[PDB]
Amino acid sequence: QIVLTQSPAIMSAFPGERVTLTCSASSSVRSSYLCWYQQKPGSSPKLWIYSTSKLPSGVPARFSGSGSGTSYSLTISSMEAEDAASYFCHQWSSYPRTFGGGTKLEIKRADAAPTVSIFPPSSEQLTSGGASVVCFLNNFYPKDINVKWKIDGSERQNGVLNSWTDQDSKDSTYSMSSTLTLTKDEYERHNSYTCEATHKTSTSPIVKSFNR
Amino acid sequence: EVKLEESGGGLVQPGGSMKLSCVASGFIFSDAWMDWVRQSPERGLEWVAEIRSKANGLAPYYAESVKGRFTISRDDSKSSVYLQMNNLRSEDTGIYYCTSTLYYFDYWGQGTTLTVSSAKTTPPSVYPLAPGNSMVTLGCLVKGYFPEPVTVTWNSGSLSSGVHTFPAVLQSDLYTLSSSVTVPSSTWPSETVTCNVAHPASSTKVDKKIVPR
């Protein structure tokens, strides 16, 4: 089977910069049957380049492709925000048909502080017996960021689950959710709850809090 | 227009069987080659099976990991392609896409999720997230469901900007996610904000209204 290798797996580029993604094949691939798919979050992969270098309808003209034998490449003449997505190379020259591991192409932008929002356990959850405190850190850059919790001033760390979104398509920012799960008893024993966000390259954190 | 409607997904116990169906419309189905592709968090994006047009010999091809257990077939008179799966294993879990190829042009369906697990279908608990400035952020917490996925919209999709729906995380063998929406204060609570949470595997839908505390 023809194994397709896409290195590196993550790549970043400034707006307007020329970008090139590579696809290495273990054995020769006929150029007519080497294609590239683009996938954005929440959507199926779309054929983006066919027959090594040809563009289907709807694909912007700044995209191009080249290569032969075992080495192929996709090129963006000028990186744009809507080009941040996953890209897979694919061959159907020899069966089994195979895909590359994919490359997440992201676009650089200006640093942004996260909008932080904290939410207490709803009464519907308290009726059932649990208590989840939610904290959203929305629209920040870069992706590196830290979050911490405090209960009545005491620093918390256990029972915390985090989830990151992909880079947004319009403002190129990231978002994160931090959920602290506790029992109804433990939540009722305390009153003050605090979620704060800190970027290691900064001192002033963004703090939100509430009282039960 | 070109359309591939997929069905037959859901949860199945290991060793069970299931048939994925794909109904094509908007082209000459008998001229197209049909393919099934799988995308999973642990096996990446992998081709599953292919069946060619009648004029091309109608030959089927299979990936090695499914050869013998999967059978791809097509009914041209019903413009449909099927993937019948026996002895399903945990490795077969993922989003299956039905695709059609005419000339070099390839079209993919939206995909349906197949989950092979011994765990039972569990509907989610949907909890509102109301706060306790010029813009406010509301949310919905979807906790304790199985299997994937759940879909979250806001105000039946009319609230599309400023929406962040986060990937599901695994907690106590169940899935949990949250969705946030940011709106101007002039719109809420003067006008209602409701999250629509759909979990197809349990045939559940919750329309949770975010009332102020």
Residue numbers in the entry:
A (entry chain L): 0 to 211
B (entry chain H): 1 to 132, 138 to 218
The publication says:
Polyethylene glycol (PEG) is a water-soluble, low immunogenic and biocompatible polymer formed by repeating units of ethylene glycol. In this regard, we have developed monoclonal antibodies that can bind specifically to PEG for universal detection and quantification of PEGylated drugs by anti-PEG sandwich enzyme-linked immunosorbent assay (ELISA). In this study, we determined the crystal structures of two PEG-specific Fab and one nonspecific Fab in complex with PEG. Both specific Fab/PEG complexes share a similar dimeric binding mode that is very different from that of the nonspecific complex.
Recently, by somatic hyper-mutation, the variant mAb 2B5/IgG obtained from the parental mAb 3.3/IgG displayed greater affinity for PEG at 4 °C, but the affinity was decreased at higher temperatures. 2B5 differs from 3.3 in three amino acid residues, including V23 in the heavy chain and K53 and P55 in the light chain, which correspond to A23(H), N53(L) and A55(L) in 3.3. The tetragonal crystal of the 2B5-Fab/PEG complex contains only one Fab in its asymmetric unit. Nevertheless, a similar pair of Fab with an S-shaped PEG wedged between them can be generated by crystallographic 2-fold symmetry operation. The 2B5 Fab has about 575 Å2 surface area buried, 405 Å2 on the heavy chain and 170 Å2 on the light chain, involving more than 9 and 6 residues, respectively. The 2B5-Fab/PEG crystal contained real crown ether. In addition to the K19(H) side chain, crown ether was also observed to bind to those of K210(H), K214(H), K103(L) and K142(L) by a similar mode, as seen in previous crown ether-containing crystal structures. In the 2B5 Fab dimer, the side chain of K53(L) from one Fab is not only in contact with the backbone of F27(H) and the side chain of I28(H) but also bound to a sulfate ion from the crystallization solution that in turn is bound to the backbone of G26(H) from the second Fab. Although dimer formation of 2B5-Fab buries slightly smaller surface areas than that of 3.3 Fab, additional sulfate-mediated interactions between K53(L) and G26(H) from two symmetry-related 2B5 Fab are likely to make it a stronger dimer. Instead, the inhibition effect of crown ether on 2B5 is more likely a result of its binding to K53(L), preventing dimer formation, rather than directly blocking the PEG binding site.
